[PDB]
Amino acid sequence: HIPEGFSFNNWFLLSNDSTLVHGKVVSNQPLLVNCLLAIPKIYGLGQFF
Amino acid sequence: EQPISFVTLPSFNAHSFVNITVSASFGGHSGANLIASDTTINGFSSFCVDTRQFTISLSYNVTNSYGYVSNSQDSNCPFTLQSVNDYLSFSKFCVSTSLLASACTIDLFGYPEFGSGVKFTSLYFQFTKGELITGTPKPLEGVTDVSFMTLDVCTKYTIYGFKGEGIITLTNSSFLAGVYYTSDSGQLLAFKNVTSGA
Amino acid sequence: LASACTIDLFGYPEFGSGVKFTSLYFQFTKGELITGTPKPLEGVTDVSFM
Amino acid sequence: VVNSQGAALTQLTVQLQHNFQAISSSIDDIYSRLDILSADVQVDRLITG
Amino acid sequence: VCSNSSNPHLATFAIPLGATQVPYYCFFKVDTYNSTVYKFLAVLPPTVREIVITKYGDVYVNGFGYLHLGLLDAVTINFTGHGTDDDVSGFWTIASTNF
Numbered sequence: 001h002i003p004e005g006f007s008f009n010n011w012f013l014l015s016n017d018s019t020l021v022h023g024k025v026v027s028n029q030p031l032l033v034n035c036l037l038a039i040p041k042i043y044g045l046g047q048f049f
Numbered sequence: 050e051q052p053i054s055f056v057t058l059p060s061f062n063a064h065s066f067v068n069i070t071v072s073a074s075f076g077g078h079s080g081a082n083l084i085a086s087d088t089t090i091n092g093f094s095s096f097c098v099d100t101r102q103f104t105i106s107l108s109y110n111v112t113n114s115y116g117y118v119s120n121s122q123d124s125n126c127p128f129t130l131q132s133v134n135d136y137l138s139f140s141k142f143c144v145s146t147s148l149l150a151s152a153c154t155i156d157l158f159g160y161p162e163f164g165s166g167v168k169f170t171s172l173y174f175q176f177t178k179g180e181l182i183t184g185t186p187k188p189l190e191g192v193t194d195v196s197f198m199t200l201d202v203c204t205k206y207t208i209y210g211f212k213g214e215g216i217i218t219l220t221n222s223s224f225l226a227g228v229y230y231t232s233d234s235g236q237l238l239a240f241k242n243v244t245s246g247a
Numbered sequence: 248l249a250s251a252c253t254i255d256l257f258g259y260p261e262f263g264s265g266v267k268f269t270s271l272y273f274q275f276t277k278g279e280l281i282t283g284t285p286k287p288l289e290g291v292t293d294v295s296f297m
Numbered sequence: 298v299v300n301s302q303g304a305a306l307t308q309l310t311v312q313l314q315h316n317f318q319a320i321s322s323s324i325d326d327i328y329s330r331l332d333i334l335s336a337d338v339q340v341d342r343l344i345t346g
Numbered sequence: 347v348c349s350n351s352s353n354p355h356l357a358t359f360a361i362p363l364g365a366t367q368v369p370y371y372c373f374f375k376v377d378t379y380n381s382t383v384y385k386f387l388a389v390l391p392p393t394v395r396e397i398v399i400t401k402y403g404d405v406y407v408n409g410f411g412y413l414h415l416g417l418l419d420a421v422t423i424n425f426t427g428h429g430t431d432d433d434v435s436g437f438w439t440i441a442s443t444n445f
């Protein structure tokens with residue numbers, strides 16, 4: 001789960017169309033996490049996923 | 050005398066001219082009966098769209114003693130070559146003379162006035178909607194931003210497949226996300242300059 | 248035939264094309280006589296198992 | 298009562314939003330995309346609705 | 347594949363760039379076992395903020411879902427080991443997201 005206080009500054013609702021300035025809704029979103037990485041340093045060597 | 054403004058995803062101009070051809074001959078068979086029918090899509094039985102901007106050209110070919118034929122088309126599709134020519138933006142499209150699923154079937158009919166008319170062939174059109182391919186009456190000359198627009202006056206517009214009549218203006222309200230903003234009733238009220246953010 | 252379900256098949260030879268093979272036609276009515284199983288049931292005298 | 302009075306208008310927006318038994322809720326679209334008679338049938342449906 | 351008025355053969359494929367260096371015209375080379383062509387996608391927008399790729403075949407960049415494709419299998423990435431390739435790397439963070 002998401003720890004609180006995080007800004008999600010560059011996080012946006014997954015929508016295939018339309019735009020909502022404000023409101024509330026329940027939906028399916030790719031937010032569950034299996035692993036986390038930050039400041040990568042190995043992809044330059046042909047890293048595969 | 051409505052001014053027209055046209056804006057879509059900004060991009061350069063890359064136009065193509067696809068031709069469809071239909072050929073028929075009656076003069077020898079019965080005057081009304083057909084000797085041979087030949088339809089070519091740029092010289093082929095099937096084809097797929099290539100450039101973002103394109104135009105379709107249909108050519109007629111009549112061989113008969115009388116020389117006078119009444120032409121008619123039937124469609125199982127909500128679109129016509131005349132209609133689609135009017136700046137119809139779309140994503141993917143291909144044509145064929147062979148049966149294909151999810152492909153609109155179109156027929157052409159000709160009345161040679163000998164007494165009985167005929168039908169030539171059925172064309173199949175599979176397609177899916179989007180903002181890749183647009184059909185225009187004529188291309189744009191050396192234009193790196195095909196979209197044309199004007200403010201301060203009421204105009205006839207079509208924006209991202211949303212056309213209507215209205216007067217357009219600019220506001221300094223800004224947001225980091227979303228390019229079009231539709232009314233809950235389904236009217237795109239405000240929107241953002243893709244290139245500039247205005 | 249009279250009021251027949253139609254199925255068609257399409258094939259792609261990896262040349263970027265898809266063509267149709269033919270159409271098959273069916274007549275049918277709901278009922279009990281004949282049933283479609285994914286594997287025949289054996290060792291059973293009364294087919295129903297509960 | 299204040300909640301009561303704050304009602305009976307949103308649903309009005311709801312119905313007008315719908316497309317009922319027609320190609321699209323944009324009358325001009327079909328208008329531009331089709332001949333007269335078929336769209337006439339659908340708009341009759343729509344206006345009746 | 348991106349480019350900025352610098353096209354060894356994309357200029358031959360379709361127009362030199364279509365803009366100058368600051369804009370970046372970028373295509374997909376449709377590289378497969380039989381044919382190879384370039385499909386124009388777009389130019390570098392003023393701002394790009396996050397990326398996400400879904401198995402279904404649509405990549406959502408900055409939250410718009412530009413284009414869908416068929417179900418995805420995998421991907422590989424390489425800039426170089428040339429110093430700042432990870433020092434000024436845009437990836438502050440990367441997460442294996444699930445719906």
Ligand SMILES: *[C@@H]1O[C@H](CO)[C@@H](O[C@@H]2O[C@H](CO)[C@@H](O[C@@H]3O[C@H](CO[C@H]4O[C@H](CO)[C@@H](O)[C@H](O)[C@@H]4O)[C@@H](O)[C@H](O[C@H]4O[C@H](CO)[C@@H](O)[C@H](O)[C@@H]4O)[C@@H]3O)[C@H](O)[C@H]2NC(C)=O)[C@H](O)[C@H]1NC(C)=O
Pocket residue numbers: 014015016017402411
């Ligand atoms: C905007 O518009 C797009 C376009 O429709 C929407 O995208 C849909 O997203 C949903 C959410 O995942 C998709 O639903 C999924 O469909 C999968 C289809 O797989 C079958 O079909 C392929 C061929 O296309 C076959 O090869 C394959 O073998 C399958 O037979 C399902 O597999 C998914 O299954 C889900 O449920 C099972 C449980 O049964 C889970 O185990 C899975 O993990 C998964 O959760 C799922 O049903 C849908 O297909 C997408 N549409 C299309 C056309 O593909 C967007 O949702 C919509 N909205 C937004 C905001 O973008």
Ligand SMILES: *[C@@H]1O[C@H](CO)[C@@H](O[C@@H]2O[C@H](CO)[C@@H](O[C@@H]3O[C@H](CO[C@H]4O[C@H](CO)[C@@H](O)[C@H](O)[C@@H]4O)[C@@H](O)[C@H](O[C@H]4O[C@H](CO)[C@@H](O)[C@H](O)[C@@H]4O)[C@@H]3O)[C@H](O)[C@H]2NC(C)=O)[C@H](O)[C@H]1NC(C)=O
Pocket residue numbers: 071072073074087109110111112
């Ligand atoms: C609109 O469409 C009609 C068809 O409905 C066009 O009429 C012809 O269409 C054919 C078929 O597409 C085109 O090809 C032509 O074939 C003709 C057949 O040859 C007969 O006539 C010649 C005399 O002209 C005789 O010598 C011959 O023995 C046949 O009796 C020929 O005129 C041409 O082919 C010739 O050259 C080739 C190559 O050298 C030889 O192999 C042939 O045997 C033959 O000698 C021609 O290729 C053609 O488009 C149309 N031909 C004519 C004469 O009109 C209409 O023209 C078309 N209208 C348009 C496009 O505006």
Ligand SMILES: *[C@@H]1O[C@H](CO)[C@@H](O[C@@H]2O[C@H](CO)[C@@H](O[C@@H]3O[C@H](CO[C@H]4O[C@H](CO)[C@@H](O)[C@H](O)[C@@H]4O)[C@@H](O)[C@H](O[C@H]4O[C@H](CO)[C@@H](O)[C@H](O)[C@@H]4O)[C@@H]3O)[C@H](O)[C@H]2NC(C)=O)[C@H](O)[C@H]1NC(C)=O
Pocket residue numbers: 059194198242243244245246247
């Ligand atoms: C915001 O929305 C508006 C429409 O509502 C659009 O803004 C236009 O965007 C286009 C392309 O981005 C601009 O096009 C201009 O074309 C000029 C070509 O015509 C000139 O050609 C020669 C050589 O320049 C001149 O000698 C001749 O006299 C013609 O005048 C270019 O010259 C322009 O370049 C100049 O302006 C741009 C900014 O637009 C600067 O970056 C350049 O350095 C240079 O100063 C330009 O390419 C057009 O000017 C924009 N405005 C208008 C009113 O059309 C877009 O949709 C969006 N904004 C942008 C910037 O795209």
Ligand SMILES: *[C@@H]1O[C@H](CO)[C@@H](O[C@@H]2O[C@H](CO)[C@@H](O[C@@H]3O[C@H](CO[C@H]4O[C@H](CO)[C@@H](O)[C@H](O)[C@@H]4O)[C@@H](O)[C@H](O[C@H]4O[C@H](CO)[C@@H](O)[C@H](O)[C@@H]4O)[C@@H]3O)[C@H](O)[C@H]2NC(C)=O)[C@H](O)[C@H]1NC(C)=O
Pocket residue numbers: 290291292293295
């Ligand atoms: C309504 O619901 C009730 C409650 O379930 C059913 O009552 C019993 O249902 C079971 C099955 O659900 C019946 O069991 C069957 O018995 C038959 C006869 O029993 C003997 O038959 C010979 C006698 O020598 C031997 O095989 C053996 O000793 C059995 O004890 C069998 O014919 C049935 O299967 C036989 O054949 C298959 C295939 O060859 C073999 O695999 C089996 O091993 C077995 O030999 C089955 O065993 C039972 O008879 C019912 N009555 C009772 C318990 O009084 C009703 O049947 C049900 N009505 C329906 C469904 O219409």
Ligand SMILES: *[C@@H]1O[C@H](CO)[C@@H](O[C@@H]2O[C@H](CO)[C@@H](O[C@@H]3O[C@H](CO[C@H]4O[C@H](CO)[C@@H](O)[C@H](O)[C@@H]4O)[C@@H](O)[C@H](O[C@H]4O[C@H](CO)[C@@H](O)[C@H](O)[C@@H]4O)[C@@H]3O)[C@H](O)[C@H]2NC(C)=O)[C@H](O)[C@H]1NC(C)=O
Pocket residue numbers: 377378379380
């Ligand atoms: C589209 O994208 C796919 C991946 O999604 C590509 O598939 C890979 O393609 C590369 C090269 O194009 C393949 O690498 C080469 O494979 C050859 C044989 O395939 C075997 O590959 C691995 C071993 O790497 C085996 O486990 C597998 O079972 C296959 O049997 C190898 O012979 C090559 O090695 C050569 O070079 C080395 C260099 O040291 C020599 O030592 C060898 O002796 C030999 O000469 C090379 O490894 C890769 O295998 C493909 N993988 C998959 C999963 O497909 C497609 O190629 C790409 N499309 C195009 C047109 O390229």
Ligand SMILES: *[C@@H]1O[C@H](CO)[C@@H](O[C@@H]2O[C@H](CO)[C@@H](O[C@@H]3O[C@H](CO[C@H]4O[C@H](CO)[C@@H](O)[C@H](O)[C@@H]4O)[C@@H](O)[C@H](O[C@H]4O[C@H](CO)[C@@H](O)[C@H](O)[C@@H]4O)[C@@H]3O)[C@H](O)[C@H]2NC(C)=O)[C@H](O)[C@H]1NC(C)=O
Pocket residue numbers: 433434435436437438
């Ligand atoms: C995300 O992107 C931002 C862009 O703003 C980066 O932040 C700036 O990065 C540039 C370089 O990419 C910095 O400019 C250089 O700063 C050096 C100071 O060292 C650190 O200082 C900043 C904090 O002020 C750190 O954040 C940053 O990591 C720097 O590493 C100066 O010493 C440099 O001067 C000289 O450097 C080289 C040395 O050879 C010379 O060739 C140059 O010509 C130059 O004269 C240079 O000024 C800038 O200071 C950064 N600003 C801020 C506010 O951080 C982020 O680093 C980047 N992060 C990630 C993770 O991608």
Ligand SMILES: *[C@@H]1O[C@H](CO)[C@@H](O[C@@H]2O[C@H](CO)[C@@H](O[C@@H]3O[C@H](CO)[C@@H](O)[C@H](O)[C@@H]3O)[C@H](O)[C@H]2NC(C)=O)[C@H](O)[C@H]1NC(C)=O
Pocket residue numbers: 065066067068091105106108
């Ligand atoms: C599909 O369409 C036609 C099929 O007939 C072909 O392109 C056509 O080519 C002719 C000859 O170049 C063009 O005629 C020219 O017209 C201009 C005026 O527009 C005139 O100045 C020239 O002297 C010449 O007569 C014709 O316009 C053109 N039409 C189209 C639709 O392209 C070709 O087979 C296909 N078109 C392509 C590939 O662009």
Ligand SMILES: *[C@@H]1O[C@H](CO)[C@@H](O)[C@H](O)[C@H]1NC(C)=O
Pocket residue numbers: 220221222223
């Ligand atoms: C236009 O800019 C001015 C600058 O002060 C601002 O006050 C005004 O609200 C802006 N208009 C908008 C946001 O529609």
Ligand SMILES: *[C@@H]1O[C@H](CO)[C@@H](O)[C@H](O)[C@H]1NC(C)=O
Pocket residue numbers: 046423424425426
């Ligand atoms: C990344 O790797 C591929 C093949 O492994 C190679 O062709 C390409 O040049 C590499 N990229 C760079 C920037 O070197």
